[PDB]
């Protein structure tokens, strides 16, 4: 009954066969009109950007180009196959309006299918593994699609693998269809018809090597078939995270870990679509290099690309050592950074997973990084109760030369801070009467810091708040059964003060 | 010393003067090369996408078009002005390579300038209000630009306002510059040269209205001036959140709530560049309608646009009531959803801020939404210790006629679950010998639910973790001084079971 | 019976003193909790009002173990059971305990069994639920 995604390929295609033999309905690239009826037409025509600093930093003689595929409507390279599959299913008459579309996907195809369904009125149900980032979950909830999850490490053929769950859902809900991104020939055909033509028509029909990451296999197979038909000189390479078994020869695969952090690439089975015969070499990519290269891309070229692009460029910097001056290398950057905001893009998560060690984070920072906050000339002699009137603060502050003072209640609980200039400006604008209490103008937000913490911690705090209050806390005991506690402000500090201290010490 | 951003516009332009009199250097649009030398060339030529459902939902007779400006390199409509400002500063010789740029901005221009500096090699410092989302902070930190925050409720001319802290930092650090997105003539000129010529050329100049939220004021000034010079018949409509003083006549600004949730529009001072003589009408727009319309856009059209897009469509659905069939309207959607992933896109945050009300949420849900999970046929007759061997489980589950069983240690702490078919697949794959323990193949993650919760809570849980275990707690006491607690897995519920129950009840 | 408002958040050992139950039930808002041994065997029920009445009568002392006041006998029911079966059970005994049964295997040769209590129900609760549904 159930048809597996691991079935051997049944296509009769082989290199050199004339295009007339195709039983598939090829579509020539469509000319996007001046105004396009639906957002779905903004798929394709993506730009190719030459990398400038990664090439030199790692001894690349050749010109290195990146096919930025993450500027599509849904922000992924999985927006071509979704649209193409929907188009083919509608043209073949299988899909009627109002039907239910179930798709087992690693998120990226899910967003594309949900977008297409929302535009065209279909109901969409998405099944994706557990490890997918929560940003995809949020975007799918917003797009109105219904989500179902499956365990991280369930084997592909198990009753509760994402493919299996999708199958049983399709066999349970009435009038539903699984487009089956793994087996549907429209998947590789989408790239073979649109992506390959654009790649060859931008670089103008010549290129030495192509580097690509392999998930469902359409990305690489669809491009490679057209390239070998039209430009055989290209060396097709594939990337695959350490843990998945796509790569050949089997020796490359020998490792035990099965769960890897990079999302969207690598599988525990060989997809039906993937045509490994048109792949001339393979490399295995770990996670540390993938995330480091993603961060390096973001920070040195402005390409807001995800981790899979990091793996792609990390493999490219190795494979492309073979090339020489005048040669051209291409990388496919699948998806946008949007889906990884809480992941590697965040330093906290990187340290938590250990992909970046503390020495790597600290060794490059300026000289003053390890100085304690104690080294600053912090001082705040006076504090004002929140009930004091505006004019009282104006006179009391300008009489003593100060222009800002912490606000603390009699109990010692800090409420915020007040700046003389702000009160003066408000009075000039009439937003507060001189008799009005400071509670109306006090800044109610700030961050609390301690003496022992380094200036690096202070700088990482000031990126979130303006006023950092150096404070202290004292526990006051009575009998070991009756106790009390109190705290107090030392002196305000801001980016201005820290920068002035750095300038003074360094000069 | 300090030049205020509210200084009156010294420009001599008035509607009708020939452009040849302009003292500014105009740059005509041109076709970028087939491969972009660097990412920044992928700015402009963004698509105009027709709006289908939102227009009819409120009975708008006219055809409604949108200018999706969130496909720029930085994902915003503030990558045009950043590039233009950098280009003009370089052309006039003010900025030398290696100089430091400091810019007070509402994030979006911050991201654009940080990207430009990262690509072209400048040290960049961004000053932004404290209230802006941490998504922009993360994207900036990844790009390497330093960040400084300011209190949200500080008056524009106070010492610690962003436009003030920027000035103080500029006076402090040597060889530093402020491009001043507020005063600089490049800001409006960018849109006047690129955006307007794109708009009036895409739709062939036959448009009747335009809507564009107002921040710095360039967005509307630069487009309205060119539209009136080319096609004065088109009305120009601004927008502004309640609590800002940009709208005229003054009576529209009469409201008392200062802070507002929408990010990046509306200011407590009139920007020098904001040419209010070319704004034919004004509206206000609170936060509730802004976010509601943003969510409606995402769900019903697929335009992954941010809050300001909602604040603009909420006004366009009012103003466009005056048009009739045949006429055309244009809206300007500033930024992408990428900046608000944890904000309005999150239902929890919307409910917390009160923009969503439980009635509007539940009234859309199906009938079974409010039923208790207690109504399901949940059950869990057996369980196993983690030490049991794989073969023992394989035989015992088939003996008892089940397929999955909770795994709980003797102390009652639940470890996870395990399923028959997954063990069979593991045995076939050799990952476990029959003598091996189930600790290898257990699904080590799940979410805990209680009998009282409604099926809506269960459906929200199932979007994150596959297995929802219906646990129960009994606290066992001995003398009111010694206490003990334990829990057990009454039943296991998954999306499949929920759908089965729904179908059975419905049929 | 799975559709009733059954519940039983906490329970006590029979060895707990009468005063301890007296204080705990009012402390946490309950009036009757199951009495269960350390191994999980259900002995019976105890009620706050009955403890108070017996203390007033002088038949027990606050230091006395609740084992004296427990309602040592009852009948047992399961979720699948219909309300009709619950009514038939209540015709013979006051307390009907909704309980659970589980088997915790170790090697498919070695096995152990344990049980716990869902909640309590009486004619009062049954009639209250009937009225609440009828209205
Ligand atoms: C150019 C001449 C081609 C011929 C003669 C050919 C032949 C066929 C035929 C007859 C089938 C149907 C098999 C079935 O229904 O069981 C098929 C399916 C398929 N074709 Fe082609 N094809 C051609 C081009 C292509 C191209 C260009 C691609 C991709 C770039 C492609 C990928 C596929 C895939 C993935 C399937 C589905 C295999 C499966 O479902 O197991 N084919 N092909
Ligand atoms: C006939 C065409 C124009 C003329 C004669 C003209 C004239 C001028 C002059 C003389 C200045 C310098 C003012 C000063 O230094 O104080 C100026 C600045 C400026 N112009 Fe124009 N301009 C023209 C077109 C435009 C256009 C097309 C735009 C925008 C789309 C524009 C917006 C501005 C702005 C924002 C400033 C800066 C004002 C300030 O910073 O205070 N002008 N213009």
Residue numbers in the entry:
A (entry chain E), B (entry chain F): 42 to 548
C (entry chain G): 414 to 548
The study reports:
Cystathionine beta-synthase (CBS) is an essential metabolic enzyme across all domains of life for the production of glutathione, cysteine, and hydrogen sulfide. Human CBS adopts a unique multi-domain structure: an N-terminal haem binding domain (residues 38–74), a central PLP-dependent catalytic domain (CD, residues 75–382), and a C-terminal regulatory domain (RD, residues 411–551)5,11,12. The RD adopts the evolutionarily conserved Bateman module, consisting of two tandem CBS motifs (CBS-1 and CBS-2) and a surface-exposed loop (residues 516–525) extending from a CBS-2 motif. Here we show using cryo-electron microscopy that full-length human CBS in the basal and SAM-bound activated states polymerises as filaments mediated by a conserved regulatory domain loop.
We pursued the cryo-EM structure of full-length CBS initially using two constructs: one where an N-terminal His-tag was removed during purification (CBSFL) and one with a permanent C-terminal His-tag (CBSFL-CHis). Multiple maps were processed using both helical and single particle reconstruction to resolutions of between 3.9 and 3.0 Å. Both constructs resulted in maps with virtually identical conformations, and both were used for modelling. The domain-swapped dimer, previously observed in crystal structures, is the repeating unit, and helical formation is driven by inter-dimeric RD interactions, i.e., between the RDs of neighbouring subunits of the filament. Specifically, one RD each from two neighbouring CBS dimers interact in a butterfly-like dimeric arrangement, related by C2 symmetry, such that the loop 516–525 from an RD of one dimer forms a clasp around an RD of the neighbouring dimer. This packing arrangement, burying a total surface area of ~1550 Å2, is stabilised through two interfaces composed entirely of the RDs. The second interface involves inter-dimeric RD contacts, between the two neighbouring CBS-2 motifs. Here RD residues Leu419, Leu492, Met529, and Phe531 of one dimeric subunit form hydrophobic packing interactions with the equivalent residues of the neighbouring dimeric subunit. Altogether, the two sites of RD interactions demonstrate how loop 516–525 is the main driver of CBS oligomerisation. Though both full-length CBS constructs resulted in highly similar filament maps, one key difference was the observed protein degradation and the presence of slightly shorter oligomers of the CBSFL construct without a permanent His-tag.
